[PDB]
Symmetry: T
Subunit: 168 residues, 12 copies
């Protein structure tokens, strides 16, 4: 019954992945954010300029908020939410911490972030799509607004590397 | 510079996690507070009752700032601080995650949580004397408080179950 | 141009109601928000736990301010808004007043409020759909905030019964 | 038992109404607030001037406030409070809703209310007196404020028709 | 002279107590607030549920507020106010402290207070009446609020034992 | 017509004054506030101690507040309010202005006011009583606060001369 | 040094008034601000639109706080300030009280308030000039804030008549 | 780099203002909102009545931030955004300025303003479907709202004239 | 497990009191804070300068919130807290109530409050020391905030006598 | 009459320019600010560093505020205000937008601003002068404060090009 | 560059402290305000009474911002501003420090302080005309105010001693 | 007696230095902070980057606050506090202003500060020590927190010179 519910969950879990389910696809979207918290707190602590130092922390909150809301909205519509260290490493994709990062130059810290922020917006990009289809009215509109933040983070980061987003 | 300072850290790491520095015993605390958020953040999403749901999201927020502040007093006292997944998984001690805890009763997450925090304090009750020896002055204050905070969560949790602190 | 203004309205309302427009479903939505306020208030006075008495009021307040929101959005797009006891009784569907719910329990109350709210969403969701077609661009946006709020109230209720959305 | 309770209830309302009681009086008072809330909400949607839309909304907000206020007061003295639509319809008095009134001029809405709030006031004033008799010490304090509020709203309105209270 | 004053004082208290005075009555009122403050403070330290700890503290805070309030009121009318422990012990009435009660259940603390605030109320209500008689115009206004506050706190508590005021 | 109105006005003031009316009484009350405002403003400019300058200004501010307050109250009951200088001079009573008093000591300003506020109070108290008689339900509530405010300001002042109310 | 303090003052005031100083014009300025407050208040109670009743009060408030400003600035530079009904009637010029303005219209009111304010500026502007010569450095600065406020009130009034400054 | 990218923009400009991109149809909207401020900012300085004066300065403020935010969602979705006088004068459509409008009645500026905004929406009702096609996700939300905002200004303006939205 | 819970407590309290623990000194500390509140209140009502009446209240407020602080910190570390009139009279030391201090002077009051506070610190300081040994890490930290507050009150008092700490 | 007022305005307008009129000279001062809005919003949008990005927007508000106030103060003293796109380009002088500016380096954006901010302060410099002469008491002091902002903007901008204003 | 510009300053310093620039006469003011803080900051630590203690810490704060703002209007008007110990000790004039003033009566520090500030104004009453000549426009305003601020501290101080401003 | 207390002070003063007295050692700690105010206000005024410009001012406050608190806490425990320009230069050690500093590069301004902030933390380092020994409970904990600020200032300043504190 306790154990019954958990196998039943995990059977349900990847049957749901493998025929793209809007939520299971956001299980990917979520764990990245979780990972990015780690990379961005690092960035706030061991990075160098005060300005970029704080903006990292700033984003480490807002990400933790996007986690919370998106999770809740998944969970309001009765869908499985990734909620543990096994499920996060296992269900993440294309973002990484990296011990070495403490002695990178900022430019290098930031360069990382510009890229693996675009790398967040792909599963988002089809998130979103599986939303409109599934008719997940509430969830969808919340995820669009995620794009924006994910997205607006870039040009901030870009002009910090005094250039344009038309490059990346 | 790149992969050299990383072993002047990683070796000094496992040498000091032995004849114990202050910031090593702490590297376990900091590393618990990381594991801990997740079990809370978990409970704050899954708990049957809405009071607890928010207490958890609140103890969580406070954890993810106890992380920030203990850290900032190490970085400040030129010492090592954990920062990546891999650093956390080696030095986490008695703290846990669980995909199976979603299905526990609210009663349980409290009890479990009572232990998790009792345990934080073994390592902090040491933090702290180590900081008392090394005469790292500012840091003593911040460690003392966190032992406090943690101490009070315990009876908060104790009373929800309808017992005293006296048992646990 | 006097009593004339009126017969045209009841006629265009009944007509609009069968080959059904966004407006005319919302008619039911707003009429039920009205009835809801009433039960919520009643619960806001007579419920037995204070924590629940407060939430019952938090909600009834929100219910007013959704009612105002929708209705603006509506007549911004020149449609008829129900406005008066007669309109709210003939257009309301499946939501009850019952003068002895003051004798039921907080549970019995919360129980029924989940039924109420499920039923509420049927027509939101209807219209929702009716809003996409009619290219009521600022209104659909808004009716999805409703769909969702309602959803958050229903799990909020579920866990106060000690339950997951699942059973409802 | 539930039904044991309800019939004692209804028997008593009738006993108390006819050899009149502070609560009984205040049951039409409250019913009329409930009606007022609607005519006000209608006018704060459909009236022409924005100055009057906002005021009318302000007055409805406040009636709700007065509702909760007088009701808890009465509850504290173990008194019955009209809580459902079917209680509000039986016990209301001289306040109407009119679907036609959306088609009225601002000047006639104002003028209509001068009347309602005036009529509201003759139950209030009677009530006021019973509360004294019945030594309901904190109830009386409250009704006197309701009385006063209606008087401030009457010459609000009187001055908006460029007249003076004296006329009406 | 100092002692000239004090003995006039004590003689008068006794004259005023026995052919009773608004002030005299209010001297047990105030003494009971002073006692209440303690039982409340005890329960807001030792009670099990955090919801009740915070409430109990809130009620003690407020009793202090009511203390200062009623006292300055009485001072303005040149009246004697109990100010010391030895005045509080003589003039208190039906409120006890119990060191044992830390070992009581929340349910019995709640229940005990229902009783105190009820008993507090029969001096208040008597007082209320003398204030009128003695034409103490702004004093009366005040005691009526104290009376009401106790009534709101009684069914606060009654609903927390899942009952209704009517019982007690 | 304008002049039709004014002479009805003045005739009535005289009828109402002599077989005395709550409004009539309150017309000297208000006149004395108007005078008070001046002596207070003078002392809050010319007094020596900054502690007394600020207090005196605070008391003038508040008299203005009480002015507007009592007046609208009276307006709501369709009553005449003294509004001009020539009404304030006829109807004032025992409050003076003195250009000499800028040359007084703080101690004698304080002392002078003890007197004014005392005298203010015997119209207020009379007024208070008529309001009752005349069943002016929200007026009475108000005057009682004015009465109380003057009493709090009297022993404010009494304690500033290191004495106690009892003396004056 | 007693009644002596006074004759010197009336003599130095009359003297200062003819070969006229900044002080002695301000005497008229402050005395008119006083009279103004009175008419504004009267309008703040009796005017017919509420929007105008509020502005009439906004202003009278500002009029108090200019009166205080000027007067500080003044006696900061050791000059005599009018302070008392006798000073304010003998030094006031061209500003009226009139007990039947409560019967005129908002327009008739606003009309006259433009006349009033124009006249006010004559003496500000006088003194202004008187302040430049006397090298009253902090006072002139301040009297120009007055000149202007007054100016904003006069067009404010002009447009509520439906007009440009031009016609006045 | 200098004068080369400027035609890779200016030519891509007039090619896309043809087979329409999202950000081109918008370049007209953004370009209206620029023209619009000026006619408002105008009215906010010249209007006969002080209510309108502020509504205009407020719709103005909101326009000059609708500019900022639509822009920031283009810059973000690497697209062109207008920015100089010359860009605005070519792409402004049906929007106007006028030195002669100072002398209009307040009535007129409302009517005129009703048109200006009706017109904004032709181009936004297109904005928007173009954004719906290109699957520019974040931007859809922001365009939808602005169609809303604009939609509500219309009936605000309609009711000031004493008509419904139904005409315009 | 009933009345048993109690005898164990009085026995472990008396035992703990002789070979004295941090807990058992604090017992005296808290019991004196209690007595202090009482005298401070009394002074907060009867003192003669208002400035002193306010500070006497500022303090008594702080005294409550130290009492709560200490007591938390305490039972966080499972120790017994005095809680009830009997505990506070048998454990209090050297701090007085005296019903005729209302007749002494502000000076005579302040004088004695320095004696009171000196005496208070004796036991804080004791325990303080008792807290260092018992490794009550979060409690000692806190008892030093007390030591100091008390110290600031004593010079605050010294200078209101016109004196330096020196003479006390 | 409508057309009569506009020729009459324009005849008056340049007769007023050509014999320097303080206001007509500020008609120049104003339009620059208007132009600078355009150049600075550009700067906020398409520039690169976050810090300088925002400070541009910041100044685009404050300029829009200087527009507003200065305009109002002109307009209080009955003087013509530039209030349209024809009058702004026609009556500006020595500031320019420049499409190309989107791809300038910041240094280059900023370099522009330092210069054409000095270029604002010349007509200001003689603004100011025509004020003192015309005796425009209110206007003058407002324009001095404009200097400061215009002026303090420079050294901000200067040290951003790590240098001194003693250069430019 | 290094030791060359320092004499193009230091010589221009002593040449301009002769045929006086604005910013030289000020260099003495700025240099007083530095000395002044210290005697205040002193008094704010040592004064017998707690009112004065805070007035001083407050005048102090205000001084240490009058320093900041006068400075920022020089730096802005490319002029020299004092900044080091040695600059201050040469140009301080009549201002003082004293280790012996700790033991003065509160009376004395007021009197002394009255002089210190009377003296500030000789140099500011000159500041100011120098700024009036050089047509340094913004700076005139700021100097005028400070003469004001200083002017008002004087009578604040005068009245504490129980005299008028008229003596000092 | 006045002169008696000052020799007696200075005899006491260096007897206290020369056998390290915790307070006399903080007399050193204090005067540096005082000196640093001078160096940091300089830095805010004549430095170049806006960011580092303000952070200097920020620290000039916080230092002035550390002065205040630390002083007070010394002074609560009856110890001599440095409180004058003679005692500050005489009792400082190892921090210096430097006229030349106005034309240093920021890097050079900052480089200074990093060093002579470590140079503050040495006497602090043994401050602190003499505290624990002397048993100065309150003082100690305040000084630890000084370390932190002094300390955390460094890594801010360090990463501004894009490096680590492990260098300096």
């Amino acid at each position: 019954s306790i154990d019954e519910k958990y196998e039943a969950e995990v059977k349900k879990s990847e049957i749901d992945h493998h025929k793209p389910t809007a939520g299971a696809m956001l299980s990917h979207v979520l764990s990245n954010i979780f990972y990015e918290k780690i990379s961005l707190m690092q960035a706030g602590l061991y990075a160098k300029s005060a300005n970029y130092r704080i903006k990292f922390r700033e984003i480490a909150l807002k990400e933790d908020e996007w986690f919370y809301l998106i999770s809740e909205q998944l969970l309001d519509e009765n869908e499985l939410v990734p909620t543990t260290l096994d499920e996060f490493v296992s269900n993440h994709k294309f973002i990484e911490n990296d011990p070495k990062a403490k002695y990178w130059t900022d430019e290098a810290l930031i360069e990382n972030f510009i890229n693996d922020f675009q790398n967040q917006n792909l599963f988002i990009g089809r998130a979103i799509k599986l939303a409109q289809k599934e008719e997940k009215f509430s969830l969808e509109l919340a995820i669009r607004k995620l794009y924006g933040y994910n997205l607006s983070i870039i040009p901030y980061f870009a002009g910090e590397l005094g250039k344009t987003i038309g490059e990346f």
